[PDB]
Amino acid sequence: DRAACFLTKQWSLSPIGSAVPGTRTVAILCCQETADLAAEVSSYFPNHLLIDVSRQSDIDWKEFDGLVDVIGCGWDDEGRLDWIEWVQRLVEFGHKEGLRLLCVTKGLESFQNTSVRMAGASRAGLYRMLQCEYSHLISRHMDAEEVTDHRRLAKLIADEFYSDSYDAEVCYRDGLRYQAFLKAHPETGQSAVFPKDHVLLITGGTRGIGLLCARHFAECYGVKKLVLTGREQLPPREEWARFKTSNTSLAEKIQAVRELEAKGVQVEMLSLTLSDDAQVEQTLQHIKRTLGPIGGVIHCAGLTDMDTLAFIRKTSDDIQRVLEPKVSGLTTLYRHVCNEPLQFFVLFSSVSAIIPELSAGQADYAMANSYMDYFAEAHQKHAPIISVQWPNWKETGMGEVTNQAYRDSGLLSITNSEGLRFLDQIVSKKFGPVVLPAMANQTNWEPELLMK
Numbered sequence: 001d002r003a004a005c006f007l008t009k010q011w012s013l014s015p016i017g018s019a020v021p022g023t024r025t026v027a028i029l030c031c032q033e034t035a036d037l038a039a040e041v042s043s044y045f046p047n048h049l050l051i052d053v054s055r056q057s058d059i060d061w062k063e064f065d066g067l068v069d070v071i072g073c074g075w076d077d078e079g080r081l082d083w084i085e086w087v088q089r090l091v092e093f094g095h096k097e098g099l100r101l102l103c104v105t106k107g108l109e110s111f112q113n114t115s116v117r118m119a120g121a122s123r124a125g126l127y128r129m130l131q132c133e134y135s136h137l138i139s140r141h142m143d144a145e146e147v148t149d150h151r152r153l154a155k156l157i158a159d160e161f162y163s164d165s166y167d168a169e170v171c172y173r174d175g176l177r178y179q180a181f182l183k184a185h186p187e188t189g190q191s192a193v194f195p196k197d198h199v200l201l202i203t204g205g206t207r208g209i210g211l212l213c214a215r216h217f218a219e220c221y222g223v224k225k226l227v228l229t230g231r232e233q234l235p236p237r238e239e240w241a242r243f244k245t246s247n248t249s250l251a252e253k254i255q256a257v258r259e260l261e262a263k264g265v266q267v268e269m270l271s272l273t274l275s276d277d278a279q280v281e282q283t284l285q286h287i288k289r290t291l292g293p294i295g296g297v298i299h300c301a302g303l304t305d306m307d308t309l310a311f312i313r314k315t316s317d318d319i320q321r322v323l324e325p326k327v328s329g330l331t332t333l334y335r336h337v338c339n340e341p342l343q344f345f346v347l348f349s350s351v352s353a354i355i356p357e358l359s360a361g362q363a364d365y366a367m368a369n370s371y372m373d374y375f376a377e378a379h380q381k382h383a384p385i386i387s388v389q390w391p392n393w394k395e396t397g398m399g400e401v402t403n404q405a406y407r408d409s410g411l412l413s414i415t416n417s418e419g420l421r422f423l424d425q426i427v428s429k430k431f432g433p434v435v436l437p438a439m440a441n442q443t444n445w446e447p448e449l450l451m452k
């Protein structure tokens with residue numbers, strides 16, 4: 001594994017060359033809040049369908065030029081997934097010779113924006129990547145400025161929609177169009193002591209990378225109190241002796257608790273529904289009462305859906321299960337730990353949040369991890385919160401089974417030791433709120449083309 005780098009999302013001018021209108025129907029996805037905007041957008045499309053999701057599909061989808069989604073310009077309820085089936089149906093049933101999907105947000109990107117407006121985060125991640133999963137699509141996320149008037153915004157939208165671009169992600173700042181790309185962090189491509197009476201909280205800490213982090217913090221940062229959370233409820237401690245010769249995942253967890261406790265660490269392995277406000281409150285009160293204040297959080301709770309790959313074959317329910325730990329779960333956890341004396345709050349995101357080619361066949365996972373990226377950017381002022389867009393870990397967790405796009409990306413799969421060193425640097429330094437640490441074979445690596 002050759003060369004370490006740290007990539008962050010940067011922006012450069014990408015002017016539109018021509019904007020030729022069509023006459024096929026354009027769908028306009030909105031909600032009650034964004035309906036006035038949607039009406040203004042609609043005046044640029046003589047042929048349109050306004051789909052207000054807060055008001056089923058008997059549509060001749062093959063007659064459409066595409067869809068403009070402006071729900072991300074309002075509140076954009078992360079828990080309401082009804083909008084998804086409109087996108088799926090258009091993607092599946094639409095013309096195979098080109099159709100356009102355009103997602104518009106307002107002030108979601110931190111570029112030339114001192115105040116991230118946390119709306120549209122999961123949806124941006126979907127639209128960024130759909131053209132890599134479906135070769136016939138042109139799909140784009142566009143971020144406008146929060147100040148932009150509806151009339152001006154509608155004009156920008158219409159030109160963008162019918163543009164000659166295949167850029168995955170763009171923003172407009174002071175009337176100028178910019179495209180997103182990845183680049184080695186600007187200058188940095190020490191550490192304080194973790195207090196012995198504070199607790200390190202690790203969600204998804206019971207196996208995989210999170211457990212590896214647990215061992216690492218106990219060994220190298222002198223952590224004395226660990227709370228490791230997952231979904232499984234371990235049996236009472238009195239039962240544990242019956243699992244000595246078991247080869248089960250539960251046996252391994254029990255053994256891991258014992259090995260940590262041998263290092264002189266107090267360890268609790270808990271079941272916690274992270275999106276359940278009442279349970280998270282109660283559990284956090286228990287920790288604070290009986291162990292001590294929270295000195296750090298590592299958010300590893302996460303699932304990939306390995307059964308249903310195609311976006312158009314996923315149900316709302318499937319998608320919700322993948323989002324839950326990273327979206328609702330993260331938000332709920334944050335509300336109950338943001339006033340603790342945190343040294344760090346590290347989110348385990350993925351290269352699939354941001355590299356469209358790797359998102360393919362796992363669109364819901366890209367949505368989930370994308371939300372965490374923006375969440376860190378939006379809350380960096382209030383908490384030492386960092387989203388890490390991890391590459392594949394070769395030796396622990398979900399494992400590798402890496403595909404051609406991953407190999408073709410020039411990303412390498414990383415060792416545990418590589419990953420932990422990456423983590424230590426990310427905590428010790430200011431790479432900013434979102435960073436993609438990669439091991440790359442330097443000869444054959446063009447980070448600046450990763451998002452194209």
Ligand SMILES: NC(=O)C1=CN([C@@H]2O[C@H](COP(=O)(O)OP(=O)(O)OC[C@H]3O[C@@H](n4cnc5c(N)ncnc54)[C@H](OP(=O)(O)O)[C@@H]3O)[C@@H](O)[C@H]2O)C=CC1
Nearest residue numbers: 204206208209230231232300301302348390392393397398
């Ligand atoms: N492995 C890799 O290469 C990469 C991993 N990541 C991310 O790193 C994190 C850990 O990855 P990995 O170690 O492979 O994962 P594993 O599947 O090995 O471990 C998942 C852990 O999270 C817990 N968990 C899963 N779903 C939930 C949920 N809904 N609520 C609470 N806890 C949950 C599991 O608990 P239980 O055992 O009780 O189910 C388990 O402790 C994930 O968030 C993943 O997206 C990112 C990039 C690459």
